[PDB]
Structure 1
């Protein structure tokens, strides 16, 4: 039986800018680095950066909607978004759903998000206003 997300691995084209982004800009803890990657943590998340010459710096119009959202409190959201803005980090989408969300790109174009709110919160909102074709499972 699967018990959760064990780790997220992102392929990166250049290790040093990716470490700078995740450790210094985003505040994740760097536990180890080697010639072709790094291990960080973000709360319970184990993140691996893997240096990969196949990684392309990918514009957001060229990738699909697959994306990775990090948790932040409502109280901290606006100042963290402003930090990303000051750093010139590109936005790939505006928020139109429930709960605060800031949609930003990593140095290789990985699609990231800051989001406030849980799955339970989303399901409660959806129960009140279901999406087209929505059905729930108890």
Structure 2
């Protein structure tokens, strides 16, 4: 019986750059750092960074990691990261505000307003092709 998400671990080529990005830019709290990785926390989320020499990042697909944000903070978050030169990988077209940006290795991140139920509710009114609810 699984209970939910316990932790997310990301391979990173430049552990100092990745710590700076998650901690200083995104507001994760650094809880431990060692020569081959780091542990950080954001709300309930346990993030691990694993130092991976020569890691070139993932290839191009839709695998991605979305973090929550309050509606009132969305615009200012997106503006902040834009002003800091973060690269975007997707322009939003689905329910709920979303800002889609890359981390230093090219992991695909998202800041999103809404949840599974808000998505399901909007999809019932405006469904994707072949969509079925259960």
Same fold (TM over 0.5): yes
Please state whether the residue corresponding to 1:104 is helix, strand or coil. strand
Match of 2:107 among 106, 110, 115: 110
Any stretches of 5+ residues in structure 1 without a counterpart? none
TM-score using structure 1 length:
0.94
Any stretches of 5+ residues in structure 2 without a counterpart? none
Please name the residue that 1:100 is paired with.
97
TM-score using structure 2 length:
0.96
Give the root-mean-square deviation of aligned CA atoms: 1.0
Task: Find the aligned partners of 1:131 and 1:63 in 2 and give their Cα distance.
Answer: 23
Task: From the two aligned structures, give the one with the greater strand fraction.
Answer: 2
Please list every run of at least 4 consecutive aligned residues from structure 1 whose deviation after the TM superposition is greater than 4 angstroms. none
Task: Find the aligned partners of 1:5 and 1:57 in 2 and give their Cα distance.
Answer: 22
**How far off its partner does 1:54 sit?**
4.7
**How far off its partner does 1:129 sit?**
1.7
**How far off its partner does 1:86 sit?**
1.0
Q: How many residues align?
A: 134
